[PDB]
UniProtKB/Swiss-Prot annotation, chain B:
It comes from Saccharomyces cerevisiae (strain ATCC 204508 / S288c) (Baker's yeast). It comes from the Eukaryota. Keywords: Cytoplasm, DNA-binding, mRNA processing, mRNA splicing, Nucleus, Repeat, Spliceosome. Residues 90-108 are annotated as: Interaction with PRP19 and self-interaction. Involved in pre-mRNA splicing and cell cycle control. Required for the binding of the NTC complex (or PRP19-associated complex) components to the spliceosome to mediate conformational rearrangement or to stabilize the structure of the spliceosome after U4 snRNA dissociation, which leads to spliceosome maturation. Its absence leads to an arrest of the cell cycle, possibly due to the inefficient splicing of TUB1. The chain holds residues 346 to 541 of 590 of the full protein. Present with 784 molecules/cell in log phase SD medium. This is Pre-mRNA-splicing factor CEF1. GO terms for molecular function: DNA binding. Disulfide bonds: none annotated. Belongs to the CEF1 family.
Curated annotation (Swiss-Prot), chain C:
Keywords: mRNA processing, mRNA splicing, Nucleus, Spliceosome. One of its GO terms (biological process) is mRNA splicing, via spliceosome. This is Pre-mRNA-splicing factor SNT309. The gene is SNT309. The keyword Nucleus applies. Belongs to the NTC complex (or PRP19-associated complex), composed of at least CEF1, CLF1, ISY1, NTC20, SNT309, SYF1, SYF2, and PRP19. It comes from Saccharomyces cerevisiae (strain ATCC 204508 / S288c) (Baker's yeast). It comes from the Eukaryota. Involved in pre-mRNA splicing by stabilizing the NTC (or PRP19-associated complex). As a component of the NTC complex, associates to the spliceosome to mediate conformational rearrangement or to stabilize the structure of the spliceosome after U4 snRNA dissociation, which leads to spliceosome maturation. It is found in: Nucleus. Present with 721 molecules/cell in log phase SD medium. Coiled coil: none annotated.
UniProtKB/Swiss-Prot annotation, chain D:
The chain holds residues 1 to 139 of 503 of the full protein. It comes from Saccharomyces cerevisiae (strain ATCC 204508 / S288c). GO terms for molecular function: identical protein binding; ubiquitin protein ligase activity; ubiquitin-protein transferase activity. It is found in: Nucleus. This is Pre-mRNA-processing factor 19. Residues 54-125 are annotated as: Required for self-association. Belongs to the WD repeat PRP19 family.
């Protein structure tokens, strides 16, 4: 075994709805497009 | 003068001095319609549609009153633990049925929505002013990785 | 299937709209908005405390 | 089986030596970082005091639905936390109404004892 | 970002494979040439021991970072419940003793209301 900071957005509801939705969209449409490649 | 202040603060009120209401003469009128009426006037007096008046009643007489009642009062510990569980079940039953009253909660939220979202919008716009600049700083730097990577592969490929 | 069809699964579009004088259903929906708004206002407090220091460090 | 802070099944439980209580490593640490104490007994305890001490995987059933489950479960826990706090405020509120009557009653006994004292003097005469 | 030996921003970072820590190559090289060891743990290390591929990464921002976020949410809210579980056990314990002292006292109010009126009923008749 061998700190990282992410600044949680000012408008941080969205984490359940909008952010999580985009993450599984971005995972889905990339790997499908990667399978196409 | 320090001794006199120590006598007045302690003998002012047991509930008021220790820790945590709106004035209601109609509630006192509705509740009556004798001991209940005595505590109602006692609450209206200490608090001071509300008239104040009683200020000559509330240390030695209270100590003897407390010592006498203590004399009158394993088996006593279990009867209090059983009754406390019964009242706890009645409190969990009154809460499960609810989940007139609904209009008050929505208005409580409208206060919150107002108070909180105004704070949110001020916290947001204060942050945004400082952080939209730093977002652009951070986000335009991210785009540099996406070009620093894409060139990397073409050079590795060509290598 | 999601990528092929080009359709993302719908999330809970409920908390945002709601309506006053509803019923037992909107009594819940109302009480949801309160707790999350308090969590929100607490979630904005610990951000502003540090403020721009946490951002510029990243 | 249950950590006595959250109610979860602990995935890295740690026991306090001042009071016999298996907590979860994450939750006990946050409490000690807030104030150097044990949450149950309020005894002086530190992070080095802790001694690091069943795992059965949930197979929900036969993914878009699992999105809405997690939505509902957070939606439920938010209300199960809310309902438990308004009840605490109203049990304290109704407790405060009892304290006023308790102290108001023992003032009313003082006047009743005077009426008894006045009566005992008249009976003797 | 820092070198653990000097404290500067290292311009050629090389990570060791015995005590995992980012050292500056020019600094750690001299440490190894002094004696074959890792400066932190004092375990053996040589220069060859000191050191992604094809998958492209993006910076750590607000899926995995989102999942660890939701742990912070729930783990904090779980402590919020303790503040109300512990405070409930004090209020109900004070309520139990309060209602018991109320129930033990009101029997004495009932007897004094009897005795003071009985003394008035007795005396007035005589």
């Amino acid at each position: 075994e061998i700190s990282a900071q992410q600044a949680s957005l000012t408008e941080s509801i969205p984490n359940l709805l909008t952010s999580l939705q985009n993450e599984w969209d971005a995972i889905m449409l990339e790997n499908f497009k990667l399978r196409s490649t | 003068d320090n001794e006199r202040s120590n006598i007045k603060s302690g003998k002012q009120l047991k509930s008021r001095i220790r820790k945590f209401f709106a004035s209601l003469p109609s509630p006192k009128n509705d509740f009556e319609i004798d001991e209940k009426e005595e505590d109602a006037e006692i609450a209206e007096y200490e608090k001071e549609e509300d008239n104040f008046i009683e200020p000559p009643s509330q240390p030695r007489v209270s100590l003897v009153a407390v010592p006498l009642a203590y004399s009158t009062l394993k088996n006593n510990p279990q009867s209090a633990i059983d009754n406390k569980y019964n009242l706890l079940v009645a409190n969990a039953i009154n809460k499960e049925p609810h989940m007139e009253s609904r209009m008050q909660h929505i208005t409580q939220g409208r206060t919150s929505m107002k108070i909180q979202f105004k704070t949110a919008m001020p916290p947001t716009e204060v942050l945004l002013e400082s952080i939209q600049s730093k977002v652009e700083s951070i986000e335009q730097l991210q785009r540099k990785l996406q070009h620093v990577q894409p060139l990397e592969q073409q050079n590795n490929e060509m290598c | 299937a999601l990528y092929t069809e080009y359709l993302k699964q719908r999330n809970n579009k409920k908390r945002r709209t709601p309506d006053f004088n509803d019923d037992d259903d909107t009594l819940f929906l109302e009480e949801y908005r309160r707790k999350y708004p308090r969590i929100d206002t607490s979630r904005y407090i610990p951000n502003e405390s540090s403020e721009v220091s946490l951002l510029g460090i990243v | 089986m249950l950590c006595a802070i959250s109610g979860k099944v602990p995935r890295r439980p740690v026991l306090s030596p001042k009071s016999r209580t298996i907590f979860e490593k994450s939750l006990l640490e946050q409490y000690v970082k807030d104030t150097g104490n044990d949450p149950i007994t309020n005894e002086p305890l530190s992070i080095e005091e802790i001694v690091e001490i069943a795992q059965q995987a949930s197979l929900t059933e036969s993914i878009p639905n699992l999105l809405t489950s997690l939505q509902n479960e957070w939606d439920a826990i938010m209300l199960e936390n809310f309902k438990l706090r308004s009840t605490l405020d109203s049990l304290t509120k109704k407790l405060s109404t009892v304290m006023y009557e308790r102290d108001a009653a023992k003032l009313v006994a003082a006047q009743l004892l005077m009426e008894k004292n006045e009566d005992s003097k008249d009976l003797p005469k």
